[PDB]
Design a protein around this ligand. Structure first.
Ligand SMILES: O[C@@H]1[C@@H](O)[C@H](O)OC[C@H]1O
Ligand SMILES: O[C@@H]1[C@@H](O)[C@H](O)OC[C@H]1O
Ligand SMILES: O[C@@H]1[C@@H](O)[C@H](O)OC[C@H]1O
Ligand SMILES: [Ca+2]
Length: 305
């Protein structure tokens, strides 16, 4: 039994970790580590690196010839706790060492997610896993996004052959948010710092009060940069099987059939994925496939692009 996108022109991948492991390669052909590549997962204690969970995702991806998306170098959650109180110069040396460490250990990263959530969750908080290192990367600076520039400069320096991606949520749901995001992309491109645009597209981003057409128009706007688009963390809630199925039919094709979208990654498929309470899983606890998954296999087989 072969992955859904086996004969398609773009990948259909999934978040990977212990609860998503069973049967993974029979469904998906690309992966992102759900949690193990966050900095606070690897370096919870300063200067001792626990690569075990990240190694598990990378080794699995390689064993299965699937592209690996490193998630994530800079974010405002699940960052180490010890960095919060260091002076910015010291924080910066730690950031640099984290970049260099990842680059050395993982030579075959397909897509490096350098910054996730610049419009929503910058590393500027000092709560649990907040990081509080925005000023180590120059803060907002002249342009308003200096720290994003600095993060991508470090990634270019340390990963000279790797495709660099920016990622965020609640982008395609509004023109104003898409224009905001594209200002960051514009600033990055002044120095040719970014290679791909990611948008997460969780359930909360694609609800029907905003028409799918508006998401399509914003995809076109993002695509106007000439950069490839990736849908990075897709999920649709399933309080009933039928709501989930109807949502899949309404939402999924718009992203899948967009000529600038070069891959979609679901944010899990088995119970225990992030939106478990909302029953976003496509396979039930008893191992059975839900009607949205039945539909999705057929739809992807019929849409190779
Ligand atoms: O790491 C993921 C993040 O990028 C996004 O906010 O969705 C939840 C997290 O699991
Ligand atoms: O509580 C954290 C959760 O919200 C995420 O995954 C890692 C956990 O430590
Ligand atoms: O497992 C969760 C992941 O899906 C998101 O980030 C928070 C984590 O707790
Ligand atoms: Ca260190």
């Amino acid at each position: 039994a072969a992955p859904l996108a086996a004969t398609a022109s773009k990948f259909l991948g999934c978040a990977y970790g212990a609860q998503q492991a069973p049967g993974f390669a029979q469904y998906w052909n690309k992966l992102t580590p759900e949690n193990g590549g966050k900095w606070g997962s690897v370096e919870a204690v300063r200067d001792q690196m626990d690569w075990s969970t990240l190694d598990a995702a990378y080794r699995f991806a390689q064993a299965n010839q699937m592209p690996f998306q490193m998630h994530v170098m800079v974010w405002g959650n699940q960052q180490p706790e010890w960095i919060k109180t260091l002076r910015p110069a010291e924080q910066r040396r730690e950031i640099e060492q984290w970049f260099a460490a990842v680059a050395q250990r993982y030579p075959d990263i397909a897509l490096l997610e350098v910054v996730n959530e610049p419009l929503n969750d910058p590393p500027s908080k000092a709560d649990t896993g907040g990081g509080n290192y925005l000023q180590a990367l120059g803060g907002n600076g002249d342009s308003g996004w200096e720290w994003v520039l600095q993060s991508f400069r470090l990634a270019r320096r340390h990963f000279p052959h790797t495709k660099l991606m920016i990622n965020d949520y609640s982008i395609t749901s509004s023109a104003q948010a898409t224009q905001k995001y594209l200002q960051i992309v514009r600033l990055l491109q002044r120095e040719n710092l970014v290679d791909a645009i990611g948008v997460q597209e969780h359930a909360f981003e694609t609800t029907p009060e905003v028409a799918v057409s508006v998401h399509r128009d914003n995809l076109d706007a993002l695509a106007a940069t000439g950069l490839p688009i990736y849908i990075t963390e897709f999920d649709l809630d399933g309080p009933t099987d039928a709501q989930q199925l109807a949502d899949y039919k309404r939402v999924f094709p718009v992203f899948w059939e967009h000529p600038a979208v070069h891959g979609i990654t679901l944010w899990g498929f088995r119970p225990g994925l992030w939106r478990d309470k909302e029953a976003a899983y496509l396979i039930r606890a008893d191992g059975t496939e839900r009607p949205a998954l039945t539909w999705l296999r057929d739809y992807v087989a019929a849409h190779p692009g």
